[PDB]
Amino acid sequence: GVCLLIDAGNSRIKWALADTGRHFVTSGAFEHADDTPDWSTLPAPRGAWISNVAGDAAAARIDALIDAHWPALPRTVVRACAAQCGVTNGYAEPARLGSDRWAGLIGAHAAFPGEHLLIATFGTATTLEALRADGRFTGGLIAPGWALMMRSLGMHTAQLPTVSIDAATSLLDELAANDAHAPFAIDTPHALSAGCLQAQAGLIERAWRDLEKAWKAPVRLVLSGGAADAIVRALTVPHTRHDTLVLTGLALIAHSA
Amino acid sequence: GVCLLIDAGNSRIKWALADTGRHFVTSGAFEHADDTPDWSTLPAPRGAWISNVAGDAAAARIDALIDAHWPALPRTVVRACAAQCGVTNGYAEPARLGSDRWAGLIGAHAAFPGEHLLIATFGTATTLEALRADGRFTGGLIAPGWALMMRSLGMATSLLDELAANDAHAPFAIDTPHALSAGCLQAQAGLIERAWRDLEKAWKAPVRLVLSGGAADAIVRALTVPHTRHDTLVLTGLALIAHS
Numbered sequence: 001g002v003c004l005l006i007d008a009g010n011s012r013i014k015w016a017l018a019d020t021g022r023h024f025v026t027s028g029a030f031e032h033a034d035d036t037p038d039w040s041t042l043p044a045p046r047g048a049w050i051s052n053v054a055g056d057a058a059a060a061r062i063d064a065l066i067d068a069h070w071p072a073l074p075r076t077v078v079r080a081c082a083a084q085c086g087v088t089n090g091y092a093e094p095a096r097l098g099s100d101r102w103a104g105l106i107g108a109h110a111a112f113p114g115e116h117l118l119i120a121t122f123g124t125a126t127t128l129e130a131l132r133a134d135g136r137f138t139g140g141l142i143a144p145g146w147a148l149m150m151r152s153l154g155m156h157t158a159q160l161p162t163v164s165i166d167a168a169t170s171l172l173d174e175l176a177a178n179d180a181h182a183p184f185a186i187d188t189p190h191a192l193s194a195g196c197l198q199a200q201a202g203l204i205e206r207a208w209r210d211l212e213k214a215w216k217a218p219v220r221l222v223l224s225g226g227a228a229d230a231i232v233r234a235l236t237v238p239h240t241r242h243d244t245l246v247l248t249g250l251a252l253i254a255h256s257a
Numbered sequence: 258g259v260c261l262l263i264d265a266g267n268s269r270i271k272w273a274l275a276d277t278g279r280h281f282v283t284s285g286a287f288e289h290a291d292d293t294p295d296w297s298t299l300p301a302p303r304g305a306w307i308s309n310v311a312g313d314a315a316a317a318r319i320d321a322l323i324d325a326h327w328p329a330l331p332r333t334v335v336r337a338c339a340a341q342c343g344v345t346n347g348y349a350e351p352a353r354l355g356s357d358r359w360a361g362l363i364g365a366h367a368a369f370p371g372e373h374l375l376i377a378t379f380g381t382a383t384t385l386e387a388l389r390a391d392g393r394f395t396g397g398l399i400a401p402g403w404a405l406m407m408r409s410l411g412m413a414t415s416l417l418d419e420l421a422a423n424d425a426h427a428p429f430a431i432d433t434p435h436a437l438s439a440g441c442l443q444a445q446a447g448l449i450e451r452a453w454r455d456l457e458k459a460w461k462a463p464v465r466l467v468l469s470g471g472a473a474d475a476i477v478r479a480l481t482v483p484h485t486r487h488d489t490l491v492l493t494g495l496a497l498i499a500h501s
């Protein structure tokens with residue numbers, strides 16, 4: 001019955017064991033450089049389905065973990081394609097879309113049936129994808145995430161005061177503690193943090209409003225990936241968080257005909 | 258009568274000779290090295306007023322050019338302060354505000370009397386400054402500019418030109434390079450629009466969006482907020498300081 005689902009990204013592997021397209025028996029997560037998951041306890045899976053955007057070392061690690069537990073287990077390295085699980089890929093070259101993004105589109109299509117979606121994923125980059133209710137993925141936008149913008153300004157811009165990666169964390173925590181209002185600032189470090197917050201929220205809000213106007217129907221803004229607490233609090237438009245779009249999509253792929 | 262005004266920024270040095278109020282007899286620019294302005298022709302100035310955010314080598318170059326033409330000319334290095342020329346500095350530490358930003362706020366206040374302003378400058382960073390109708394500079398927002406955002410994502414001139422030709426309210430892209438370019442552009446436009454609406458809400462009154470210097474056609478085109486361009490706020494501000 002059960003399928004092992006692996007969602008490997010920059011530093012973290014998230015995983016689930018699924019007995020259907022939508023149901024997880026259990027799940028967890030671990031850092032790929034250091035950790036080993038507790039899989040000694042799991043029922044043996046029929047196969048594994050893997051989304052890996054973390055590179056070849058992570059691929060070798062995933063294989064090592066799989067084969068240490070279930071030698072020679074069948075596995076499928078998931079990739080974007082032209083059409084799958086109700087989604088049609090609008091990319092000019094479908095296979096150039098990231099596997100995590102493809103699995104996530106499939107999960108969203110299933111999780112929110114009958115709905116036009118704008119999917120915002122918060123990672124190193126902030127990614128926005130437009131998904132029609134009929135399953136057409138019509139395209140994307142990518143912008144730097146808040147920390148990446150803050151690195152540009154605080155560490156890579158000579159003419160601005162130094163704001164370290166760790167100092168940016170402080171400013172982000174303070175934004176959240178202030179419910180992410182981000183007023184015009186009266187000191188330069190706060191001008192950086194508030195301007196970067198305003199860019200993130202402004203991006204998402206603009207894209208959502210324009211998509212409703214373009215498609216002439218309601219659009220659900222779906223938040224995926226990192227918590228992005230300050231960004232989420234700043235938004236003035238309605239939104240729905242879903243934390244397992246990629247794993248859900250992998251379950252669907254695994255249990256498809 | 259006439260005052261020499263110097264606006265030394267990161268990219269080059271701009272200058273003007275101003276006689277009456279904000280009017281310029283002439284103006285020009287020069288690179289930080291090797292260029293010499295043709296100041297042999299100018300009428301002798303009473304003094305020079307200098308905004309320099311470019312550092313000490315630029316300061317030395319400026320002094321060298323001044324003293325080569327008008328030895329020992331009186332000069333004043335402009336710095337942000339608590340209040341000057343109708344503007345009040347809302348920075349917690351007024352002197353931490355850049356002198357260029359200060360002069361520009363003063364020039365803006367004079368150019369648009371009685372108006373609330375959002376002043377946007379498109380440089381390596383995108384800088385937004387809020388200036389209330391009573392002259393209070395109430396703060397700033399800074400984000401990376403388009404090119405810097407692109408660089409951070411691993412990336413461009415062709416892409417930027419291509420964006421001007423496209424519908425900025427139907428921006429979703431079908432390949433990764435265009436998704437990056439459009440995403441960065443949407444972030445710039447979204448930033449400006451959100452900040453503007455926030456000021457109109459905070460102040461319960463109309464706000465003029467002023468573009469200080471140039472902006473990519475694509476960014477300007479993407480905006481749904483009307484704007485006014487003004488290319489000489491700093492030098493205009495320096496003229497007002499000089500005469501005060």
Ligand SMILES: [Cl-]
Pocket residue numbers: 027028029030036037038
């Ligand atoms: Cl685990």
